[PDB]
Chain length 193, copies 2
């Protein structure tokens, strides 16, 4: 997939199905979500997850003009897998403002230290926040957009059902590479061409 | 806000619950919204002292260099006598939408302006914060209770100047020497 303005429901048509969509997409995300320790969450993004977010943004902001719709499509384009990469939203979650505030400082650069490993191939580190200019990218955020680029040997093994593991080697958030749910890895394999 | 004025970890820990309550109350006279997605907090010695103590507490910092570092980090946010200083937050219904908005909002800080009565607007100058430098005429009018308005003329976030609640404006005037 890519998505275009014609891929989207109007505000009226979405509002009619919104509650049903919240449930449909929650169910879908069971095949797309991974936790990394107690405070990091990754959602691997696909047509379903991205279309929903766009619908949600348009609904809440009440956006129905053509340039405004297009601007949300273009804002969410970073999440679209392209054939050779998995895309994920990383969220850092802490119980309170002071805790979160302290964590975000301590965890600076964590979005660059999350890695995947398909079977025994070389690990692949996320490339984060390429949609943000250098200065914006340097400001911390509880939310990052990640890209994991996979080569041919990794694509073959993943589609063949090999184990997929995720880790982090940030000094303040060391997570030993651990196998992802095979049902989730199977869903991810389908994103790749 | 001096070095000798900070509380030890032990002393702050004793007052922390009460201080939270007191600062939440205080921030009600300091916070201003610009449209639906921008939230400013006008900083003063009360909000900045609270922030320092919170970070010393949470990270358990009791070494001199570390304590002095936290102070150095926040001391720039304390108004200097002829100025107002605010921290800006961008806020959406959830955090993923906020992140999806950030690229469009680049440069928003430079486009936030205040206007004291019918004086010229003052644009913010870009721990990040917004610094609004007031001229003597503006300082006097504000102190004397004139209207204070705030807006934004960023191309992705055009918000017409709106008057700030008079109780908040009164608090801000007290920052001025
Ligand atoms: Cl002050």
């Amino acid at each position: 997939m890519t998505l275009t303005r014609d891929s989207l429901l109007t505000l009226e048509a979405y509002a009619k199905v919104r509650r049903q969509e919240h449930a449909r997409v929650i169910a879908h995300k069971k095949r797309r979500a991974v936790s990394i320790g107690n405070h990091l969450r990754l959602l691997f993004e696909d047509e379903t997850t991205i279309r929903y977010q766009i619908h949600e943004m348009l609904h809440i902001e009440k956006i129905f003009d053509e340039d405004g719709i297009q601007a949300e499509l273009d804002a969410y384009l970073p999440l679209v897998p392209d054939g050779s990469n998995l895309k994920a939203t990383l969220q850092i979650e802490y119980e309170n403002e002071t805790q979160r505030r302290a964590a975000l400082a301590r965890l600076v650069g964590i979005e660059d230290r999350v890695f995947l490993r398909v079977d025994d191939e070389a690990p692949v580190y996320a490339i984060a926040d390429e949609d943000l200019e250098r200065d914006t990218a340097e400001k911390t955020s509880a939310v990052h957009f990640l890209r994991f680029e996979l080569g041919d040997a990794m694509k073959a093994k993943l589609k063949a059902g090999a184990p997929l593991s995720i880790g982090c080697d940030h000094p303040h958030y060391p997570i030993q590479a651990a196998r992802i749910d095979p049902d989730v890895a199977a869903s991810l394999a389908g994103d790749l061409d």
